Design a protein around this ligand. Sequence first.
Ligand SMILES: [Mg+2]
Ligand SMILES: [Mg+2]
Ligand SMILES: [Zn+2]
Ligand SMILES: [Zn+2]
Ligand SMILES: [Zn+2]
Ligand SMILES: [Zn+2]
Lengths: 206, 206
Amino acid sequence: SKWIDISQPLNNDIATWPGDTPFSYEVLWSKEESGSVNVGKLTMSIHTGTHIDAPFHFDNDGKKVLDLDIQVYVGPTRIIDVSNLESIGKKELEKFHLEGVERLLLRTSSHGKANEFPDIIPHLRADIAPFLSEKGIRLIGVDVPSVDPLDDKELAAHHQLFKHSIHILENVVLDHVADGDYELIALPLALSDADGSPVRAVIRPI
Amino acid sequence: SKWIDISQPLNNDIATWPGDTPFSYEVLWSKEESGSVNVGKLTMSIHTGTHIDAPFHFDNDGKKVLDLDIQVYVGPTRIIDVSNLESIGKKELEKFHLEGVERLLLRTSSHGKANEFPDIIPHLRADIAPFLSEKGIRLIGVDVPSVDPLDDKELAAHHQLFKHSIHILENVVLDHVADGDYELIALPLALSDADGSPVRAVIRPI
Ligand SMILES: [Mg+2]
Ligand SMILES: [Mg+2]
Ligand SMILES: [Zn+2]
Ligand SMILES: [Zn+2]
Ligand SMILES: [Zn+2]
Ligand SMILES: [Zn+2]
């Protein structure tokens, strides 16, 4: 079975958090100019497109990207539909059979426009974290830019998730994939000091 | 079996090519400033650390990163030792068992210092490409910054490899891994317009 891309295309039209570094890929020096190669430059916010958060993003004493365990970001994953819900917590996830699940992707289908930043999204409620952690879930992914409300300064979901050893993947693209079981790859770059990393998230049906 | 990291750590001390953008990770907004999060800004040449080249790097009409087939960058890989050789071509690879191999990583052990740019490296000779392609090899990886000599402006190996449908992975770290068969992951970011991408390359022993 083929790997399926669930990442947002990265280009100058992609949205960012309000005021954050705009995405920029540019050819600084062309093959015609250099006589051999197109020399590029990439400038971006960490939290652009499909990406993972490190605890340092919301906790000054939290792990940086390179400290994160790579095993978390590769392996069996379950994908479920949680569309048409203002927020997702224990109550909403109790209806799913999640025994033995290690990684969980949530399709909210709430936004899905990579080149616009949403005004509101469905967030995850804090009680989701003990619930998921008890099941053995080590990674949660969402198809929106955040696990907390866009205007929230407390970031209760970010904090509680990492308190329970649950890692965070944001802006996956899931409208073209069915619910069910897959193998996931969503590896951070080896960034020694960073608060997160863009990733190429892909999945393969089991 | 656990995944093993074969990527170079990315930080402000990493080496770059002569003439390339220096690597920069900075915290744009501190948690003190934003009131909630540390937000990072990443500026880099795509040919920094462990990365893949897109044909657009050396051919104006070549594919950009997002156009590359993701299947090439995930799957069975063989790792072999080609240390203490000034250059590697058909002659040097004939002695290896490579039947059915799809992806090949070459340990030159020539450099291995991510924070220094080498003065000389072992390059791949152009006759490597028809040889590897005939065996079905779709990806070649090296533990140095280039498949061509550092001062070479023609980039014969880059061109010939692509001419034979062989993709290119550079700056893997292989000094801590044994020869043999593994599963490789080395996925480019979903960069619409780029000449290459940093990757998180990891391997798992069969
Ligand atoms: Mg020229
Ligand atoms: Mg603390
Ligand atoms: Zn984020
Ligand atoms: Zn986040
Ligand atoms: Zn390169
Ligand atoms: Zn190259």
